[PDB]
Amino acid sequence: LNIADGHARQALSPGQQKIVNELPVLWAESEQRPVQQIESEAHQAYFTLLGQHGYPAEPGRVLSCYSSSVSMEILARSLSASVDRVALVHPTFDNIADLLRGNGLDLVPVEEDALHGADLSAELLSSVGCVFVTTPNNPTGRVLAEERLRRLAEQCAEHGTVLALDTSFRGFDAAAHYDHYAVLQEAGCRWVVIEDTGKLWPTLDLKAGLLVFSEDIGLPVEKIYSDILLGVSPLILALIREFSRDAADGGLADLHAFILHNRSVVRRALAGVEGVSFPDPESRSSVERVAFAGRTGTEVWEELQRHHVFALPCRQFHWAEPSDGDHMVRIALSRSTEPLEKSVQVLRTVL
Amino acid sequence: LNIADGHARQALSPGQQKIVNELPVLWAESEQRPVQQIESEAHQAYFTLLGQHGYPAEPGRVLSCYSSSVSMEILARSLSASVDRVALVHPTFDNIADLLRGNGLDLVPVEEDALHGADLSAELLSSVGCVFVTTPNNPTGRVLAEERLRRLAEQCAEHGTVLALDTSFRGFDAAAHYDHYAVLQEAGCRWVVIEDTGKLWPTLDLKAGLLVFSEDIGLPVEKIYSDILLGVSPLILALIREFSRDAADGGLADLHAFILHNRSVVRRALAGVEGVSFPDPESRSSVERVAFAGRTGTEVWEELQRHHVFALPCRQFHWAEPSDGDHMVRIALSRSTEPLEKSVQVLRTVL
Ligand SMILES: Cc1ncc(COP(=O)(O)O)c(/C=N/[C@H](CCCNC(=N)N)C(=O)O)c1O
Ligand SMILES: Cc1ncc(COP(=O)(O)O)c(/C=N/[C@H](CCCNC(=N)N)C(=O)O)c1O
């Protein structure tokens, strides 16, 4: 009863199973056509699916990577020559912090209330070479609103600061489907976006990170990318294209309704308990934070393990101040509903 | 007419076509069995296929990565924690150098004749924390013989040096099919090997790098691997498993015969031209160097392009002295014979 890893483990839909049934046809197509044609079609399907109409479609402005984390490694190393300090949203997915810090960058935490609620201080922006924002954020689900993205982008441009976005959870929240690329190109900061197909669908970790960057980024992303790969499998791009097309023809709506149901299953199952609260009431992400007073997320985690239920304590996400996450756990929602409901039912009895 | 990229673009055999036809069955399998089980089966079939029987089969000793270059990035960044200087075979695939140099390692080139023909000097082993050998080497095809691998491993153990091997081309040459792991364990040096499935078969870049290391490696490979990925798709591991089994069942002998045929087609078209010569007469790799007098490899490439034939100039492999490769191009042999044959007929008239 794994509710820890955020990737999708629910069954395929009928439309998605039909895609999988035609994998030999996609293989034939991948053998027959220029990879670039399929990649263009995959990018267009995925970006247009999620409202990113102004993405740069000239071949080579979007670099297909095996994963978001590969893209992130390329970005961190590309930053490390010219940047000492990154302002990083806190909490966020902890590997972002480990990848930046492992490549020699010093991190400055920016709390969410500060990031979403007001302009960043000039003193901060002038003291960092990059601002890095996960939107929708993991674990909180919080979406950087369009006006805030615009003001942040403008401020980064004013300060010569790179604006980097990790938009991996984009597909789950329509609030994140306004055209980010329009905003960034309009603002004219040096920017980079890491899109990710890998959390949306149960494609057995067949996915791509998509590293997108402004023409003036002034970082060696293209070169270091080239150092790591020539490209991703056309079969995976064809897969992405088809899953995006199925998503465009109602699949995406069905996925939102399914995550909403599982989020509901979780909140109904725990609402009467303690002492329990749900810090992110408006989140539509595929992961869910749960907070409780009295006990520690680590304790709760330890006890759930005894019952073969595996969630995540939240300490790891508060990468600058782990005690900040002492009283919360994270629960994965991209799960078949029956196994998910068993999981939180154990959680309820433990509490 | 692409004869540049090393990856395989020849037609599927009947038996490989049959594996592609079962991709939906392998998908359902991947959904239903623990990834670790499939991974162990994939590893066992690939290592055993190529004679690497003493590979450490305990889970977690073989780290499955999206590609050999991802494995290489992990190794490079791990080395930089405690190593300043790496001795690297020269020429070799230039990403190996660009990844090491880009993670902050200083490179000492070791020409192939030094590496294969004599012990490494005490002066050299006093100055480097790692020796890195690509075997079979790309682009030369040169195979590190068992006697030299043993002696190299003995010297690394004596000095405390890490011995690192890149064995992506292993499957093409039966001279590389003696058990490298037995040699490395016998010597007791710190060692790391990057195996790669992606050059052998036309799998549309569905592949894994396999990062294997001694228990005393004393480098943070497990931590850095974990920061970049959790694992590779079970569908890709299942495919590796099935392609390795088809190869054990005669595929591999047929592939050796196919590559030999195509090498003969190239040499048939060219060995009487000019001024033309073949630097690596004994190579059995899927890539082939051609030398010429008078003109430059870059200039041959430009003329080939005009006729829509894309080969590779060799400068980039001589990563410490590119002018060493000024008079050579590389030709990909993992190609359908007819396109390859058109390609060299064009290259013939050019020369
Ligand atoms: C905002 C964000 N950006 C990037 C990544 C990197 O994903 P990647 O592994 O490279 O495919 C994550 C990962 N989230 C983790 C899944 C861990 C990887 N899952 C997997 N099985 N491949 C989580 O939320 O549990 C993330 O939340
Ligand atoms: C000894 C060696 N170790 C690692 C690599 C990295 O392999 P990877 O691209 O990560 O799957 C190569 C690559 N050889 C290059 C292929 C270029 C990549 N092709 C692709 N389509 N992804 C060649 O010889 O042409 C190599 O020769």
Which of B244, B273, B308 is where one domain is finished? Answer: B244
State chain A's maximal CA–CA distance in angstroms.
Answer: 61
- Does the beta carbon of A68 lie inside 6 Å of ligand 1? yes
Residues of B in contact with A236 (CB under 8 A): 206
CA pair distance B58, A113, nearest whole angstrom:
46
CA distances from A325 to A97, A114, A164, A279, A318 (A): 16, 18, 24, 11, 6
- Report the C-alpha gap between A291 and A314 in whole angstroms: 9
The residue among A244, A262, A281 that closes a domain is: A244
Q: If we measure between CA atoms, which residue out of A342, A264, A279, A272 comes closest to residue A314? A: A279
DSSP B242-271: HHHHHIIIIIHHHHHHHHHHHHHHHHHHHT
Examine the domain organization and report whether B85 and B14 are in the same domain: yes
Technique employed here was X-ray
Q: Quick one: tokens of A192?
A: 């980079």
- Which pair of structure tokens corresponds to residue B166? 């890149």
Q: Give, using CA atoms, the residue closest to atom 10 of ligand 1.
A: A69
- CA atoms within 13 A of residue B210's CA, in its CB half-sphere: 29
Q: Which helix (H) or strand (E) holds A25?
A: helix A23-32
Same domain, A345 and A219: no
Does A166 share its domain with A256?
no
Residue B28 belongs to what domain range?
10-244
* Run of H or E including A264: helix A252-270
- Which residues in chain B have their CB less than 8 angstroms from residue A21's CB? 24
Closest CA to A331 of A346, A321, A320, A318: A346
- B214 in the same domain as B86: yes
Closest alpha carbon to B324 in B314, B312, B334: B314
Q: Are residues B132 and B93 both part of a single domain?
A: yes
β strands within chain A, DSSP E: 62-65, 85-90, 106-111, 130-134, 162-166, 191-196, 209-213, 276-277, 287-292, 312-313, 328-332
User: CATH number of the domain that A1 lies in?
Assistant: 3.90.1150.10
Q: B7, B12, B23: which to substitute to probe chain A, counting the most A Cβ within 10 Å?
A: B23
Pick the residue of B26, B73, B80, B225 with the most A CBs within 10 A to test the interface with A by mutation: B73
Same domain flag for B25 and B107: yes
Together in a domain, A160 and A21: yes
If DSSP codes are grouped into helix, strand and coil, which group holds residue A251? helix
CB contact under 8 A, A24 and B23: yes
Cα–Cα distance, B252 to B247 (Å, whole number): 4
Q: Are residues A236 and A274 in the same domain?
A: no
CB within 8 Å of A226: residues ≥ 6 apart: none
Rounded to a whole number, what is the distance in Å from the CA of A186 to chain B's nearest CA?
32
B33-52 b/e with 16+ CB inside 10 Å = b? eebeebbbbbbbbbbebbbb
For residue A312, give how far its alpha carbon lies from the nearest alpha carbon of chain B (Å). Answer: 15
Could you tell me the CATH number of the domain that includes residue A22? Answer: 3.40.640.10
**Contact across the interface for A70 and B204, Cβ inside 8 Å:** no
Q: Kind and range of the H or E element at A252?
A: helix A252-270
Helix ranges (DSSP H) in chain B: 14-21, 23-32, 35-49, 68-79, 94-102, 112-117, 122-127, 146-159, 180-187, 221-228, 234-246, 252-270, 297-306, 337-350
Resolution for this experimental structure (Å): 2.2
Are B290 and B266 spatial neighbours (Cβ–Cβ below 8 Å)?
yes
Which residues from chain A sit within 8 angstroms of residue B30, using beta carbons? Answer: 204
CA atoms within 13 A of residue A315's CA, in its CB half-sphere: 10
Does A269 share its domain with A240? no
Of A224, A244, A264, the residue at which a domain comes to its end is A244
Of the CA atoms within 13 Å of residue A247, those in its CB half-sphere come to 23
Rounded distance, CA B153 to CA B62, Å? 20
CA angle B67, B110, B211 (to 5 degrees): 20
Q: Which DSSP state fits A259?
A: H
B238, two tokens: 């299942």
Cα of B131 from ligand 2 centre, angstroms:
20
Q: For residue A25, count other CB atoms closer than 10 A to its CB.
A: 12
Q: Measured between alpha carbons, how far is A332 from A283 in angstroms, rounded to an integer? A: 13
Chain center to CA of A257:
19
Residue A140 near residue A95 (C-beta atoms within 8 A): no
**CB-side neighbour CA atoms (13 Å) of B198:** 27
Q: Looking only at Cα atoms, what is the longest distance across chain B?
A: 61
Q: Are A163 and A189 in contact (CB under 8 A)?
A: yes
Take residue B297 and report the two structure tokens written for it: 């490899």
CA–CA dist A147, A115 (Å, integer): 12
From the CA of B130, how far away is ligand 2's center (Å)?
22
Q: DSSP letter for A11, please.
A: P
Distance CA B64, CA B168 (A): 14
Nearest one of B298, B344, B324 to B92, comparing CA atoms:
B324
Q: Based on the fold, state whether residues A297 and A324 are members of the same structural domain.
A: yes
- Whether B187 and B280 share a structural domain: no
From the CB of A138, is ligand 1 less than 6 Å away? yes
Q: What is the CA radius of gyration of chain B?
A: 20
Q: Please count the structural domains in chain B.
A: 2
Query: CB atoms < 10 A from the CB of A216, how many?
Result: 10
HEC readout, B164-176: EEECCCHHHCHHH
Contact B208, B237 (CB under 8 A): yes
The angle formed by the CA atoms of residues B55, B59 and B64, to the nearest 5 degrees, is: 75
Query: What's the rounded Cα separation, in Å, for the pair A162 and A100?
Result: 14
Q: Which burial class, exposed, middle or buried, applies to A9 when counting CB atoms under 10 A from its CB (0-12, 13-18, 19+)?
A: middle
Strand partners, B90: B111
Same-domain check for residues B30 and B170: yes
Nearest CA in chain B to A26: B20
Q: Which residues of A touch B23 (CB under 8 A)?
A: 20, 23-24, 27
Q: Is the CB of A139 under 6 A from ligand 1?
A: no
Q: Indicate the pairing of strand A276-277 with strand A287-292.
A: antiparallel
